Design a protein around this motif. Structure first.
Motif, mmCIF file in Angstrom:
data_model
loop_
_atom_site.group_PDB
_atom_site.id
_atom_site.type_symbol
_atom_site.label_atom_id
_atom_site.label_comp_id
_atom_site.label_asym_id
_atom_site.label_seq_id
_atom_site.Cartn_x
_atom_site.Cartn_y
_atom_site.Cartn_z
ATOM 1 N N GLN A 14 -1.379 5.905 -11.435
ATOM 2 C CA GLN A 14 -2.122 5.651 -10.216
ATOM 3 C C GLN A 14 -1.944 6.812 -9.248
ATOM 4 O OE1 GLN A 14 -0.823 2.317 -7.735
ATOM 5 N NE2 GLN A 14 -2.644 2.453 -6.486
ATOM 6 N N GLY A 38 0.784 -1.202 0.000
ATOM 7 C CA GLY A 38 0.000 0.000 0.000
ATOM 8 C C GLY A 38 0.822 1.260 0.000
ATOM 9 N N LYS A 39 2.070 1.180 -0.416
ATOM 10 C CA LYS A 39 2.931 2.330 -0.474
ATOM 11 C C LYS A 39 2.360 3.535 -1.246
ATOM 12 C CE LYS A 39 6.360 1.666 -3.388
ATOM 13 N NZ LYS A 39 5.587 2.418 -4.387
ATOM 14 N N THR A 40 1.854 3.299 -2.447
ATOM 15 C CA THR A 40 1.420 4.411 -3.293
ATOM 16 C C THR A 40 0.191 5.124 -2.689
ATOM 17 O OG1 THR A 40 2.401 3.450 -5.248
ATOM 18 C CG2 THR A 40 0.586 4.997 -5.605
ATOM 19 N N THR A 41 -0.803 4.347 -2.245
ATOM 20 C CA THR A 41 -1.946 4.948 -1.536
ATOM 21 C C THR A 41 -1.497 5.657 -0.274
ATOM 22 O OG1 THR A 41 -2.529 2.762 -0.595
ATOM 23 C CG2 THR A 41 -3.833 3.588 -2.487
HETATM 24 NA NA NA Z 1 -1.168 1.332 -3.169
#
Ligand code: NA
Ligand SMILES: [Ca+2]
Length: 297
Positions: free
Chosen positions: A144, A110-113
């Motif tokens: 994203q 979940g790094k990007t979120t």
């Molecule tokens: Na993410």
């Protein structure tokens, strides 16, 4: 939270309550019960032994064998040991006038979120964040972040395919200048496992950009494997703090419980829900109480 352990710990304490003063051997049995509960929550042997030793010492220092309510003494000492295991005092990354922080971790953490939710948190605290989508190989990862930034109302710079770190640094500084950005959050490339080339690129990006924090985002539900991910990123890149996602899905807490001991890095944020405001500052004292069934449910 950490359902089995919490239940387990509460059960161990409760098995004492209402039965008057206990002996040293009784104190022993409870301690063994705590140690096993922690190990079943995937805590390694050394960490669990240290925890139980802490509790033993502190409980003695509070007259557990004299107490007609030793359950309460064990409650208090297990609560202190949990508080310290979880980091002790609450911690957040320091803010200067200007900051540049990397977010690192595996695909799936979940790094990007998390990068977008962090930007939103800090915008609300009055910061002016810039997200940087730094995957130089996967346009979809960058897109994203673009669309997450639009949702949370934070600008996004997207790197180019194959862009050099020196070109990235220059485009970032210029945008940050023009837009008066004071917190730059660099979402580095996420992969399902690490290999030598990206790590090399990242360690290299770190040399060129000079971030003053490197936040490692870990899926808390991975328990011991999160700690292994942490040592790989720390030795190959160098980390400054942790963010644990899906803390709501973790019945155990073993990575969380072990991070200070094993990694020497603080857990800064907890992901505790899919809401934008699901990313919260991490609160060891609060979490210790919760595990023990105190306070809000
Ligand atoms: Na993410
Ligand atoms: Ca180098």
């Amino acid at each position: 939270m950490f359902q089995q352990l919490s239940a387990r710990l509460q059960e161990a304490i409760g098995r004492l309550r209402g039965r008057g003063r206990i002996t040293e051997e009784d104190l022993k049995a409870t301690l063994r019960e705590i140690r096993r509960a922690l190990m079943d929550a995937d805590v390694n042997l050394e960490v669990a032994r240290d925890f139980v030793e802490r509790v033993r010492e502190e409980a003695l220092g509070k007259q557990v064998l004299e107490s007609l309510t030793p359950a309460e003494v064990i409650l208090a000492t297990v609560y202190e040991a949990l508080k310290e295991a979880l980091g002790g005092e609450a911690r957040l990354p320091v803010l200067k006038d200007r900051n540049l922080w990397f977010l690192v971790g595996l695909q799936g953490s979940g790094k990007t979120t998390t990068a977008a939710k962090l930007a939103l948190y800090y915008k609300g605290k009055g910061r002016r964040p810039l997200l940087v989508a730094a995957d130089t190989q996967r346009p979809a990862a960058r897109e994203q972040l673009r669309l997450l930034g639009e949702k949370v109302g934070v600008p996004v710079l997207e790197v180019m395919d194959g862009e050099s770190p020196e070109s990235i640094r220059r485009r970032v500084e210029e945008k940050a200048r023009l837009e008066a950005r004071d917190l730059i959050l660099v979402d580095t490339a996420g992969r399902l496992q690490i290999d030598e080339p990206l790590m090399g690129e990242l360690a290299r990006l770190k040399e060129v950009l000079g971030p003053d924090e490197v936040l490692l985002v870990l899926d808390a539900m991975t328990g011991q494997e999160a700690l292994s991910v942490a040592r790989a990123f720390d030795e190959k890149v160098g980390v400054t703090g942790l963010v644990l996602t899906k803390l709501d899905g973790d019945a155990r807490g073993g990575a969380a419980l072990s991070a200070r001991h094993v990694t020497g890095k603080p857990i800064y944020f907890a992901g505790v829900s899919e809401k934008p405001e699901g990313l919260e500052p991490f609160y060891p004292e609060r979490l210790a109480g919760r595990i023990l069934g105190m306070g809000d449910v």
